[PDB]
Structure formats: structure tokens, C-alpha cells
From Swiss-Prot, chains A, B, C, D:
Description of pH dependence: Optimum pH is 9.5 for inositol 2-dehydrogenase activity.
One Gene Ontology MF term: nucleotide binding
Lineage of source species: Bacteria, Bacillati, Bacillota, Bacilli, Bacillales
The protein, known as: Inositol 2-dehydrogenase/D-chiro-inositol 3-dehydrogenase
Keyword NAD assigned: yes
Primary enzyme class: oxidoreductase
The protein's Enzyme Commission number: 1.1.1.18, 1.1.1.369
Presence of the UniProt keyword Disulfide bond in the record: no
SUPFAM superfamilies per record: Glyceraldehyde-3-phosphate dehydrogenase-like, C-terminal domain, NAD(P)-binding Rossmann-fold domains
Expression induction or repression: By inositol. Subjected to catabolite repression.
Role noted for this protein: Involved in the oxidation of myo-inositol (MI) and D-chiro-inositol (DCI) to 2-keto-myo-inositol (2KMI or 2-inosose) and 1-keto-D-chiro-inositol (1KDCI), respectively. Can also use D-glucose and D-xylose, and shows a trace of activity with D-ribose and D-fructose.
Subunit text: Homotetramer.
Catalytic reactions of this protein: myo-inositol + NAD(+) = scyllo-inosose + NADH + H(+); 1D-chiro-inositol + NAD(+) = scyllo-inosine + NADH + H(+)
Domain of life, per lineage: Bacteria
Amino acid sequence: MSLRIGVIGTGAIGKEHINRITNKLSGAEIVAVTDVNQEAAQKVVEQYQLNATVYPNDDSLLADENVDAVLVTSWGPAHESSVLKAIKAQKYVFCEVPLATTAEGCMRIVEEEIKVGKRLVQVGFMRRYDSGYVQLKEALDNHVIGEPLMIHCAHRNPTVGDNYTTDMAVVDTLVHEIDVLHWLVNDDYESVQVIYPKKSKNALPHLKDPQIVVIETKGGIVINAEIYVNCKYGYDIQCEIVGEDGIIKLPEPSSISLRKEGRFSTDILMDWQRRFVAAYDVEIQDFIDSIQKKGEVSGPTAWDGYIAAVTTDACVKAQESGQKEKVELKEKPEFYQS
Amino acid sequence: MSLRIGVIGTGAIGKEHINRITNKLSGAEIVAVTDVNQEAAQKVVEQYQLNATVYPNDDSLLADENVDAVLVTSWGPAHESSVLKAIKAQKYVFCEVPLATTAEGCMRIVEEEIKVGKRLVQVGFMRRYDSGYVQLKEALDNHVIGEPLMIHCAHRNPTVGDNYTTDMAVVDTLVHEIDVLHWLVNDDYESVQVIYPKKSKNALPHLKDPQIVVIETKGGIVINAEIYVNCKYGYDIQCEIVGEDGIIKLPEPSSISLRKEGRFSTDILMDWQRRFVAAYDVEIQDFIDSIQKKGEVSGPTAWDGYIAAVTTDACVKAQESGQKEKVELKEKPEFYQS
Amino acid sequence: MSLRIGVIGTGAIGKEHINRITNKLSGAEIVAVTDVNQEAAQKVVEQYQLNATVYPNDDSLLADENVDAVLVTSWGPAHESSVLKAIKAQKYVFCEVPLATTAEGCMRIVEEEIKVGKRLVQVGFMRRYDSGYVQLKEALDNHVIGEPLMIHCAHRNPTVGDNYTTDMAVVDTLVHEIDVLHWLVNDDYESVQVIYPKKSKNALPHLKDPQIVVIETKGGIVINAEIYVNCKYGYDIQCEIVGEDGIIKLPEPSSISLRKEGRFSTDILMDWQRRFVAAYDVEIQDFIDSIQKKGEVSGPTAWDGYIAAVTTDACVKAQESGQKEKVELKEKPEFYQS
Amino acid sequence: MSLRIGVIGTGAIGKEHINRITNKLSGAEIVAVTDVNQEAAQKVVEQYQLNATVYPNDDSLLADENVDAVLVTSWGPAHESSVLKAIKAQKYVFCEVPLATTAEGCMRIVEEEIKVGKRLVQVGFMRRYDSGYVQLKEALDNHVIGEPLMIHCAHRNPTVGDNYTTDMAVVDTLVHEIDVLHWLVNDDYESVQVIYPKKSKNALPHLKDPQIVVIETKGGIVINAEIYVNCKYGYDIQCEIVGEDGIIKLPEPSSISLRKEGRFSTDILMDWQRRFVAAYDVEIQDFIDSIQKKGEVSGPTAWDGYIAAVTTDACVKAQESGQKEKVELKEKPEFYQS
């Protein structure tokens, strides 16, 4: 029996997930949609040739007893409301980043989920499903390099639009690093500090770019995360983990090599949408498969969403203060302990 | 509407394809199976929880008007018979390598398909769907290196069983190179010659390993293909194409790097079944999608199967003779021209 | 006419330079030596078969009118005294690191040299002559990456002895990075801060290792320098410079690659004495050649020694304080301006 | 005491060696020169400020009892005559490639040297002193990959002049591979065969380029050597040795890496004169040092010159015949056995 999925929010993000579920992945079907703009939802049902009911809002969609699970892919600030409604309707939910805009919002979700007795919520941190990050996690789990001590990472983007602001470097961009790193080393964040190098000619007058975020974990791991969103040369993710006895490093995306006109070279991606395509497929397939096999979801958790929200807020605070800011995290509930 | 697929031959190969269709890919369902050993087919239906009819033979399966397409994954020498039956029953067919065991067998299939007026047969040369080979093809199509002049490639395997014989290096192993290279450079083979270096200590007394196959295309491209099936260190595919003005090269499979105990290193796969997993998925998804969108298949063709059979026979002849042997190919029909 | 060189200090360092001058390089001869322990100097004259006078002290050696130039390779704290004596005797001088132990000591040398009207002093920062660093400097001079914005570097060592202390990570080890970086980007240091990750199991109880030093230049370049002197895996120098429009990176020392037992790998050096052998040769040959061609030396200057001493002191201060410490540098004299 | 060296032939090659001996290396001096054009020799003495006697011919230079050793850097076909004269005058001799133009000429030299009772002749195959080739030799000597089975190598050049002819690809260019490979694997050549791919647009009508030379050793190692002298992209030497249990490969010349405009890249040299600069220095320093320490030379031998001459002749024969040609080598004398 195919998992029957309703989609809340049919913009670009929702459309891509609908496409993968309908045309690429196994074991599920889109049976319902809703968008703030009903005309857009109807258009999407036609665009993708869905056998799907269009609902005026998420309450009515969630009341459809033929809906087993939902994707929350609406406007970012609206995610939290739908997640809470889904947990109350006892439906599984895949929520695109962010889970909620504040630590308090994530806590509301956490408290409601912990009542359910099983995991309903998976948050869309797709990097955990990227084959490179999976290999890193495997090496760490096997103690290949001894205790991790330091992490050097970078998130670089060729250019950004006029609307991209300083806070977004952490809130929209670094949030992915924020999730993946504490997962990799099984250690929680203690503090963050932001340092601004000289501003790049490639950045608009209002934007502070590049920036360096220094994050320390409770166990003493020191992370220096470079964010440079106008680096011109490409879209580029780098991550190196220095352990006691060795060093592991995320690979480049696969590319044929070229010898030509005095250079030996490989491609660097220009389009961020080409970097993690496979991970988005695998994360949604895991959502489907875990529900079918286990009756509960298995990816990044509501708690991970909480960690990200708390840490993002602290980074933005540090962007403004110039001081080292504490990351104040509640103790992780046994409900979320591996 | 899902494509309704029948499977002819439910051994290890058939089981893997059934698994991908049922659990990984989109747009198709296994509705029927048959195996020489009916008990094995029944077991597979139960193993994979299929809603599928077990037929005693391929004729009865092909007579099921609810079957739209078939996979031919039986014993190698039996492939040809099922392919011919499917073409006569006017069903689309995906045939695992080889299409047929002789040039004449492939010609029988070709002559029958060319009557149909559309392409029914796709042959399982999965390498054409590997992202690395796709990148190579793109560079060549874009004339990045000018005219290809020479190709240096290698197919290496850690060790083989007692039953692996000299002819199999070409028939089972090099056949994949044989298909992919002429596709890459759009040029047909003219001659082959086999040279034996000193025998490896890692090979059994009966096996000639390693070997070098030199293949020349009608256009004058010279290919030197190394086959070494007891190389001990890993499973390894290498391909470098030297053009007039530059050189392109297939990448290593993606791997984190490690600095440890005086070495900077990446993984080499040990298991050949881990090398092309993604390509098998993509090739079958293409079979499904092309039938749905175009009403005809789009992968390697019956003609490609013919080329492989003719070329494999010539290589085996050269293994025995020590001389340069002609690859005698009929002119490619307009039916198969891009 | 060969340059006639006297050596002040015939320990291990002095012996290596004597060896290169006598057995490897062109245009100079060792005509005189002195060591605190006369017996050791005499032994060295015999060991290397020198036609050289043994002097009881540097004053008597410097009074030898057949001495054109001196190497100062004595005990570190004793360097300054010999350098001042040589400048007064108007002899060219190559001084091993450090020029002097304090900013004030380097200033004494600077003030005396600036009177001479030509450059007499070259300081032994050999990295500027390493082919990799030379390539980096060339790219930067040619504006290949636009303005440098950030530098990520590392100085790693397999293990250290019981006597190696926390301050030495900066004074003995990072001093080389300290010299090379400001030279690369033509920008002076403004501040330093030290951050301690969790201590490595590989470090002795008294040693803080690893450490991260964050250095900001007056122009706004941010440098994060990792020092890890018990990394176990090898001796390893890494340097990446992120500019506005691209990124350049120091290469690995040259090594054949190996495919074996499931790994594709290159060597990492274990012995720090194998990393910069060529640079030591080239730096001394430059000392010889510049004196012969220009009548003045051309390498790292007394001023560079001053920068290093001031910066090293500030790092050690920051190691203790945990705060960001200012690097207070006098304005660079026109005497030292390119 | 410096080794007193006379130079026979003061063209471009002789001038470079004179420069390295006079300005770069240790332990020797140029005390005499001769060139067919006396005016050119005199000019060179002035150009390099030598304290050197100009002799009208090699006989008079060799009669100078203050000459300890000679370099033979004259016109290629004239090398043999000077080498024989030097052996008769009992002087050490460094001979640029080729030792002689025919197997018979090399044999004349061999027979005369074997009378001397010690090695006088070193042939200028500088690749044996390149750090990459030295590393390859070390791995092989240590049995890192088990028995060598196959070698894949390439000698590529960006473009050649109008005067460059088909035979020169082997005689001038591949001769270096010819020397280095049999040295690497300690195995002598048995046969050669030449195969011509389609001609490159980059080659002139008279030149066959590229070409592939297949060489088999007596022990059964199979070598495929690609020569492509109009490859446009750079000057490039590649060498991969496939052994029973692993594979070793010559590294790229060291280069910083660059991320810029969608590419991650390293430099490829354009100028062949930049590839082996260090090896030329080391080979001449070895000539000097071995004579001083051992009273006999230690590099590539007169016998190696013989092997090269015999093998080059066989390659040129195969270029013309299209058949596999024998490499007919006399048994190596105990005089030349390690």
C-alpha cells in the first residue's frame, strides 16, 4: 500500500518534492494539496497530473482520513503552525527547514511530539543523507581518527541577490552546517563568535560578506566556519575534521578531469541546486520507508530543529555584538536519544 | 498508469531488478514472473511481496495482455529466445547482457525489430548511464578536446573464482568497455589484437591474466584496454581519452580522504557490485520513462548488442590466434541512426 | 672570487649550513669558525675537511680581514650579540631564526643597520624560497584571486619531546607562518587571539596542544592558524588563501601515488627535516649570489625579524590572557621598503 | 681540490652545463673548452667569466694534463669520437645523449672502457635523477607492488617545428623513456612494435603524430608508450607501473591549486626545459661527487647508451615496417653489473 501524502505549500520547494515523489521515488502518492493561493495549488495538481484533492487550508487537508503523512513546504514562518496541527492530527510530518523560527516555537513542537510516544516529525536537513557526509559519519563512528578536535568548514556561493542580508548568512545558509556538524561528532554547541574579514568587492554595500563563525562544542571541539556568499568562482562546500590521530575530508562532487591549455582541472558547480540533488531523493525515500517499516520516522528530529533554531539565534546575536555568545540548550530528552 | 512489467528469469540479476522496480523507482509494477524453476519464481513473489502471477514459461507470460513490458534476466544463452518472443508479442523488452551469444543471433533480433517500426529493445549496458561516462560523453559532444585520437582504459578486479576462464575476460568483463567506447566516440571498431604480459602470481594456472586488448576504430582511434582480474588491490575502472587538443578522464568513485600514519588516501572499492549501483537504477528508470513519454525505448539498442557480440567474438579469436583480427560489422541500419 | 664565510656557532644547524656551502652550493668557502666550545669547532673543521681558522670568539673571527660574511648559527639567545658585532665590523650576515629574542633587540639591530646605507642582514626564514610559496607569491602579485580576504593554514608535527612547552608552539613553530604570511599578502598584523580546543591524548599533561591562533592584519585579512604538534600522522604544512574571486593553495610535497589494498594514496613526510631541504639550499645561494652581484643581501630582512619578534611576543601574551592582543609595530622604515 | 673539467662543444647544451658547474654546483671548475667554431668557444669563456684555456680541438684539450674530466656536448653524431679519445686519454667523461649513433659505435666505446678496469663514462640520461623516478625505483626495489607486469607511459609536447620528423619521436624524444624503463624494472627489451592512430590536425603533413610504441621485455613486461608531440595543452610526462598487487605512478610537477571561474586546477608546464631542471643539476653533481669519493663514475653507463642505441634503431625499423621487430642485445658484461 502506497503512503498517502498531503502537501502543505505548493511553491517551488513543494513542487520539487511533489515531482520526486510522483516521478522518481517508490512507495508513496500525493493525494492532497493546499496552498495559501488556491489557484496555485490547483495549477500544480494539473501540472503534475495528480489524482489529488485541493483543500482550502491545512486543517481541512489534515482532517482527510485518507491522508497518512504531510510535507510542510509553506512559507518559512508558517511551518510551525502546520507541524503542530499535524502532530495533533497524529500524522507523520516532513518539515522543510526551519522547523520553527524561534527556540520557543521548536519547544512547543517538541513538547507535543514527546506525548505521542513515537517519532512523527522529520526535519529537512538533507545533508545527513549526502554520500560524502555519510562516509564522514562512518569514519567517525569507527574511530578512524580518534577524538575529533577541530573542524574547518566553508559554505561558498558565487553571488547573491540584492535582498540577501547579513543575518541570512547564518539563518538560511550556515543552518545546514549547524545541523550537520553536531550530528557528525555527537557533541552539542556551547558558544559562537563572529569575525568579519575585510568586505569583498563582490558584496553589496549593506551585506557583511565574507564572515567567519567560530563555534565551540561542550566537549571542546573548535569549529571555524567560513561563509562567503559572493565568492564568484562557484558553489562550494568544504569540511575537514581534524582528530587526534588523523584527518578526514569531504570529497569534491564527482567530475571528469581535463588537461587543456596549460591546466589540469575538474569542474566546480555553479548552481547550488546541483549539489545535493541525490540527498533530497534519499531523505524523502527514508521518510517513506521508515514509516512503512517501523511506523515512525528516522531522520533529523524535532530536537535537531530546536538545536538549529537556538544556535542560529545565537549566531545572529554574535553578528551584532561582536562578542562570544552562549548557546543555551535544554537537556536532550530521552525521547530523542539514539 | 504504472507500466506493468513481467520478469523472465528470477535469479540474482532478476531479483535485483525486481527490488529496484518495487522498492526504489517510479512508474512501474511487477505483475508477472517466470523462471525455469517455478519454485524459485514463487519464492521470489513471496520474498518481495509482489501482486504477481507466476507463469510456467515465457510464452504464457507474454500472452498475458496485462503485461506491457518484460525484463529478460534469464540464463545468458537463453536471452535471445525470449527477446524474439517479446518482439513478436509486441512488448517492450529490457535485455540483460548479452542480447544474444552470436552475431547471427543478434541479427535475428535486429531483423525482427526493424519490422516493428519503433524501438522495443533496450540492452543492459548500464555504463552509459553512469554520471562519469555521461560527463565524458558531454565533453566529447561539445568538442572540448577536438578529435579523439587514443583511449587508455583498464578493467581491474581483485580476484576471480576457479571457474573464471581466459575467454571470460572479454566475453563477461571487457564487453562493457566494448559497448561504452564506440558510443563515446561515435566510431565503429575495425580490428582487435590481444597481447599477454607475464602471468600474475595471483592468477590460477589455467587463466591468462592480465591481458591487453588493442582495438582500432574505422576512423583511426587506437584503444589499449588492460584487463587484470586478479589485481588484488580493488575493483577499478579507468578510462582516459586523448584528443587533439586535450585529455579527459573518468573520475574515481567519490570518497572522503584520510591523512593517517604517513599516508594521504582515498578508498578504492573492493566489491564490483558497489561501482555502478546508481547506473542500474537510472537505466531502468529510463526504460520506464521513455516508454511512458515516447512509446518507445531509448537506451543501448539491439544494434549495440550486435556490435558487442561481433566484437567479443573477434577478441576471443585474437586471444587464440595472437594475430590482429578484423571486426566485421554490417552497416548500421537507418532504424538505429540517431 | 669565492665569498669567504665565517661561521659563528658550530652545532647541528651550523654544521648543516657548512655542509651545504662546502659540498652543495656555488661561489663561497668556509674560511673561519668559532663555537663557545672550541673543541667542537675544531672537530667540525676536521669533520668537513675545511681550510679554516678556529677562533676563540666572534670578535676575533670578525677582526679577520679575510672574512667577507658570517653565518650566525649559535644558541638562539646569543644571535643578537653577534649580529650587532657583524654590522659594526661591516660584514654581511645571515642570521638563523630568531634575529633577536625581543622586539627591542631587533630594534637595536635595525637602528644600526639603517646607518650602513645598504642591507647587511638576511634572516633565515627559508619558507620564502620554497617553490610552493614562491608560486603562491607569484599568483598574488599577479592578482589572480583579487584581494586576499582570509587565510587558512596549519603546522602539524607527529610528536614532540618532553621539553616542548606551550609557548614554543608559537616561538619555535608558528614563527615561520608568522614571517611568510605577511610577506605573501603585503599586509601587517594588527591583532592575535589564541583558542584552545580539547587537549589531544597525544600531548603531555603540561602542553596545550592543539591550538588555534587567529591573526588579523591591518587591512582586514583574517588568518586562522592551526598548530598541532602531536598529530601522529606526519609532518604537514597547509596554507590556503581565499581571495575575492578565487582560492590558491600550497601543494603537497611531491610523491608517487600508490593503489594497494583498497587505498589510493600518496606519502606524507614524517620528518620535518625533509620538508624544506631545497629552500635552505636556495636561501643560502641567494645570500651568496646577491652579495656578489649587488653588494648587498636580498632575503628576509632585519625588519622581518622585528615583525616576527613582536608578533611572537603578542601570541605568547594571548596564550596566557585568553584575550585578543594588539600587535604593536613601529612604522616600516623606507630603508626596508621594496 | 676542485675537479678540473674541460668542455667539448659549447653550444646551448654545453653552455647550460658550464653555467650549472660554474654558478650552481659544488666541487668542480671549467678549466678548458673547445668548439668546432673557435670564436664561439672564446665568446663562452668571456660570457661566463671562466679562467679557461680555449683549445682548437678535443685532442689538444685532452692532452692538457690539468684536465681531469670532460663533458661531451658537441653535435650528436660527433659524440662517439670524443668519448673514445677521452677513454684513451684515461679521463672521466660525461656524454650527453646519445653515446653514439649506432649500436656498433656504442660497442666500440664499451670494448675500450672495459679495458680500463673502472668506469669512466656516464651518459646524460637525467631522468634517473628526477625525484619522482627515484621514488618509483625505491618502491620497486622494495617490492611494494610485487612483480611489475605492465607499464603505461606518455611523452607529450605542445608543438614541434617544421624540421621535426617521424623518426625523431623515437630517436630524440622516446629515447629517455627507453633508458628509464629498463632501469626501473631491471629487465631488458625483447621486441618493439609501432602503431599509428589517426593523425592529429596539429601535426604537419610530413609527420606521423601521435604514435604508440609497444615494447615487451625479456621477462614479459608489456609497455605501451604514447608519443604525442603536438598535443597543444602542455609538456607532459606520465608513467604508471602496474604490478601484481598494486600500481605506482609518477607525480605531476608541483603546483599550487586554483579555484576560479568554475574550475579547480593545477598548472601544466608548457616548456620542456622546465621539467627536469633539478635532475640535470643532480646528475652532474653525482658525476663530480662519485669521481671525488670513488675514483669512478656512477650514473647511466656506456652499456645503457648501447641499449638505447639498439632499441632506438629497432623502433625506427618498426616505424617503417609496421611489424614487431626484435631488439637484439648482446649479453650485459660483468663490468656493468651492479
